[PDB]
Amino acid sequence: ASVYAWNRKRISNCVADYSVLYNSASFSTFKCYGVSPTKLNDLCFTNVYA
């Protein structure tokens, strides 16, 4: 997407394996707010949006 018109998808009814994300050294930035990235494999949420 162009940043003035960003894309979104409503992630729901699924298991979020955040370790598939934060184990990958491909990311030039990976900042998680309120929570440490490893703890995300334990937590739950109503939805997530990309």
């Binding site: 934060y22 184990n23 050294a25 990235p37 490893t38």
Partner: protein
């Protein structure tokens, strides 16, 4: 900003009552050992209030 005031962001395990620890060694958040140097999921444990 006065950066000289710091807190420990990371440790291998939580403190016991009145435990004190001044070690500055790299915290391994990652799947791979950090060789005693900063890198992806390999972090310096002290951070600043500034």
């Amino acid at each position: 900003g006065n950066y000289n005031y710091l807190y420990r962001l990371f440790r291998k395990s939580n403190l016991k009552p009145f435990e004190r620890d001044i070690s500055t060694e790299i915290y391994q958040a990652g799947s791979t050992p950090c060789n005693g140097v900063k890198g992806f999921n390999c972090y310096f444990p002290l951070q600043s209030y500034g």
